[PDB]
Amino acid sequence: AVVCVESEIRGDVTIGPRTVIHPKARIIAEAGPIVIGEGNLIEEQALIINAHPDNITPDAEDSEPKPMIIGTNNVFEVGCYSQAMKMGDNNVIESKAYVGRNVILTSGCIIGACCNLNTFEVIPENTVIYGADCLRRVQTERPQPQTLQLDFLMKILPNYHHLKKTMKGSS
Amino acid sequence: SGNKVSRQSVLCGSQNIVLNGKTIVMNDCIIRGDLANVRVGRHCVVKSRSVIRPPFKKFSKGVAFFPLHIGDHVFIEEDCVVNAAQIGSYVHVGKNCVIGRRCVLKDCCKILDNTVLPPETVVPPFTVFSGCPGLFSGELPECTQELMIDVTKSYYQKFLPLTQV
Amino acid sequence: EKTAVVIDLGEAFTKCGFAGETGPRCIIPSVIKKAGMPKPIKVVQYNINTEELYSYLKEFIHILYFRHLLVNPRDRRVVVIESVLCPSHFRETLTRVLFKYFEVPSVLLAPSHLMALLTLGINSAMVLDCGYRESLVLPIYEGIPVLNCWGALPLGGKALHKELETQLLEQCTVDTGQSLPSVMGSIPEGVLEDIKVRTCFVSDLTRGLKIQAAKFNRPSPPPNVDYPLDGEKILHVLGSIRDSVVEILFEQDNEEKSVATLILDSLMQCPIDTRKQLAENLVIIGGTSMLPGFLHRLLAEIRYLVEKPKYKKTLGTKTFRIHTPPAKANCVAWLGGAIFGALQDILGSRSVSKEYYNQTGRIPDWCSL
Numbered sequence: 001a002v003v004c005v006e007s008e009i010r011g012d013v014t015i016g017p018r019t020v021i022h023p024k025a026r027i028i029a030e031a032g033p034i035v036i037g038e039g040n041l042i043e044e045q046a047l048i049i050n051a052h053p054d055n056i057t058p059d060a061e062d063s064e065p066k067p068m069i070i071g072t073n074n075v076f077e078v079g080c081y082s083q084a085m086k087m088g089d090n091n092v093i094e095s096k097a098y099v100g101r102n103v104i105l106t107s108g109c110i111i112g113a114c115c116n117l118n119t120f121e122v123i124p125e126n127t128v129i130y131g132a133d134c135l136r137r138v139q140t141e142r143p144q145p146q147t148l149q150l151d152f153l154m155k156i157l158p159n160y161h162h163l164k165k166t167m168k169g170s171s
Numbered sequence: 172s173g174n175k176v177s178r179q180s181v182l183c184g185s186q187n188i189v190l191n192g193k194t195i196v197m198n199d200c201i202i203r204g205d206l207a208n209v210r211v212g213r214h215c216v217v218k219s220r221s222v223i224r225p226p227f228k229k230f231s232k233g234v235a236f237f238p239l240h241i242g243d244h245v246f247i248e249e250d251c252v253v254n255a256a257q258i259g260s261y262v263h264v265g266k267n268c269v270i271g272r273r274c275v276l277k278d279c280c281k282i283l284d285n286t287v288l289p290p291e292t293v294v295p296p297f298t299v300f301s302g303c304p305g306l307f308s309g310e311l312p313e314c315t316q317e318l319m320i321d322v323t324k325s326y327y328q329k330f331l332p333l334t335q336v
Numbered sequence: 337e338k339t340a341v342v343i344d345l346g347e348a349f350t351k352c353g354f355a356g357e358t359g360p361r362c363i364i365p366s367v368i369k370k371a372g373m374p375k376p377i378k379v380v381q382y383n384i385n386t387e388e389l390y391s392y393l394k395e396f397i398h399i400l401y402f403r404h405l406l407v408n409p410r411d412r413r414v415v416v417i418e419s420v421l422c423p424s425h426f427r428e429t430l431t432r433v434l435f436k437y438f439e440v441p442s443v444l445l446a447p448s449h450l451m452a453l454l455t456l457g458i459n460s461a462m463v464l465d466c467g468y469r470e471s472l473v474l475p476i477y478e479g480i481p482v483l484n485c486w487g488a489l490p491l492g493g494k495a496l497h498k499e500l501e502t503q504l505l506e507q508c509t510v511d512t513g514q515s516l517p518s519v520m521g522s523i524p525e526g527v528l529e530d531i532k533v534r535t536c537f538v539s540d541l542t543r544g545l546k547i548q549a550a551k552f553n554r555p556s557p558p559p560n561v562d563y564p565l566d567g568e569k570i571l572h573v574l575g576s577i578r579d580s581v582v583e584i585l586f587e588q589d590n591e592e593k594s595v596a597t598l599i600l601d602s603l604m605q606c607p608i609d610t611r612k613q614l615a616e617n618l619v620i621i622g623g624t625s626m627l628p629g630f631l632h633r634l635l636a637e638i639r640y641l642v643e644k645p646k647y648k649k650t651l652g653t654k655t656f657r658i659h660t661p662p663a664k665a666n667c668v669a670w671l672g673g674a675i676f677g678a679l680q681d682i683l684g685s686r687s688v689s690k691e692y693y694n695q696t697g698r699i700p701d702w703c704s705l
């Protein structure tokens with residue numbers, strides 16, 4: 001993976017292969033061990049979080065001892081954060097996506113612009129939300145978890161592949 | 172040139188940024204100029220805490236997302252997001268906005284604050300855009316466009332040296 | 337030659353298009369999205385300042401021709417699809433915007449049922465318009481719209497929206513962010529309308545009897561799908577709820593006030609000829625009528641109400657053959673306006689000349705002089 005010197009990580013994060021983190025990739029995985037996936041591209045200005053501390057104060061039996069995870073082809077773009085997103089296969093997060101706490105991001109997840117993810121909501125597969133229309137379950141089969149949106153994600157991943165080699169060569 | 176270099180000027184590989192005359196070099200933003208190009212021009216006015224970066228450099232076999240496209244003497248606001256867009260000259264940008272996918276704005280085309288556009292967006296000359304999806308607010312007045320361009324360059328050169336170390 | 341401006345109107349919407357235009361070019365409501373004002377201010381306003389309305393008219397009509405037409409209508413006429421009961425003074429305010437402000441060639445006022453008669457190409461007709469806030473039945477005696485026999489009652493979808501908000505007060509399982517019964521204050525009725533468009537199915541007449549059982553002494557709530565609103569607001573609504581709002585359209589206990597009552601009695605004032613005529617000369621218009629499973633359940637109840645004691649004797653055995661709209665019942669009225677403005681240039685004499693309004697400043701309505 002492209003372990004960029006500018007990619008600011010924090011804590012024990014046993015990453016995976018092909019997890020090209022771009023410059024200024026501020027993250028935090030200390031209170032929760034976030035394992036990276038295979039085939040993503042952590043862009044600039046991101047924010048990976050782990051175990052929302054006592055500022056919010058979870059006064060509901062804080063005995064978490066649970067680590068975050070990632071998946072394949074789930075490249076998150078700039079602006080968008082990552083508040084412990086239990087992703088999967090090809091769950092791309094576009095610009096300025098306000099990542100929510102308990103959103104088990106399944107496949108075919110196209111996190112649109114300025115779409116604040118729903119806390120404690122099981123993000124099923126094959127669903128792309130609309131921008132202004134929050135929670136729009138539009139394109140139930142067009143944004144299909146496999147062969148349609150994941151195929152488009154692997155197609156967008158090609159530019160990420162060329163950029164992965166280019167960033168590994170430019171550094 | 173006219174853009175007085177700010178004290179906190181920082182970016183990640185900003186190799187494509189012009190020293191625009193009568194402008195104001197603002198801090199707290201970012202620029203991926205080493206990735207691809209950006210069409211910068213003089214007499215413009217850019218705000219701080221922006222999110223600027225080139226989309227791509229036509230990364231496909233044919234022609235994918237281009238670098239950018241913008242103009243001169245434009246009135247750029249703050250916190251906007253630029254991604255796969257094609258802007259024009261003397262355009263009044265919106266605050267905390269976002270560039271739509273494959274966007275295309277002509278010269279003096281006004282932009283609404285916190286607005287975005289859907290895939291394959293377009294805008295006409297001196298045309299005001301709006302909506303979260305690709306929408307048009309209306310049209311911008313040419314007299315008001317040139318006035319905003321001149322006032323933008325004036326205020327840019329005025330507040331450009333404000334602690335711009 | 338020239339394609340007259342056919343403009344549909346109404347309590348809820350305002351559509352338009354060219355003369356003979358076959359297709360909904362656009363659909364504009366009967367409101368004006370006022371700049372600065374967060375909500376689109378309506379135009380269906382009564383006992384109100386006609387001057388601010390005059391401003392609404394100028395701006396709105398201006399951009400309105402820019403919406404449906406994108407060109408100045410000073411070349412051709414304008415088909416004004418009106419309907420009775422609107423303030424004629426307000427209508428003259430519209431007229432002064434036209435002539436006194438935009439200087440249009442000439443216009444003409446015609447009711448909706450008239451254009452419906454134009455669509456069917458028939459002469460006598462017993463047609464009801466399912467208006468937004470009201471009900472509007474209008475009989476025609478071989479091209480002569482009957483005056484003393486009619487239908488006009490505050491019996492439209494607006495009262496049904498009030499009933500919907502009442503259901504929102506009752507049935508509300510809006511999740512946290514998990515009931516939240518009407519914790520949120522106002523409701524967007526336009527959003528509620530499109531919710532009805534995608535949800536308000538209509539039951540059976542026997543299911544109407546089931547709703548009667550739901551009133552006193554519960555059956556078949558499905559088909560029913562919940563409604564998720566953005567911002568963690570998901571709530572479920574039974575099918576019996578929307579069907580109850582549909583079925584309450586005929587509360588005749590101690591008042592004998594309903595739709596069929598109005599229709600039947602309007603026919604009761606008709607003479608012998610008109611009785612059998614309107615029995616066969618029967619059509620129904622209005623957008624609100626276009627509901628899934630309502631027209632046939634409706635018709636079945638109409639035929640049932642023929643068995644009401646004072647109607648078997650009097651009306652009874654009459655074939656109630658009904659004409660059908662070739663398109664969407666709402667748009668069919670606008671289509672009839674398109675029919676009139678399409679091939680009738682000769683009828684410009686009947687159209688209100690600008691000249692008369694210039695030399696007059698008024699238009700005498702159906703009154704003297």
Ligand SMILES: Nc1ncnc2c1ncn2[C@@H]1O[C@H](COP(=O)(O)OP(=O)(O)O)[C@@H](O)[C@H]1O
Pocket residue numbers: 345346347348349350366466467468469470493529622623624625626627666
């Ligand atoms: N397909 C439909 N189903 C149900 N109701 C509809 C449909 N189309 C229109 N309506 C409603 O029926 C009414 C007829 O439209 P319109 O001509 O605007 O009525 P009005 O003349 O009272 O404004 C409107 O309230 C509209 O919302």
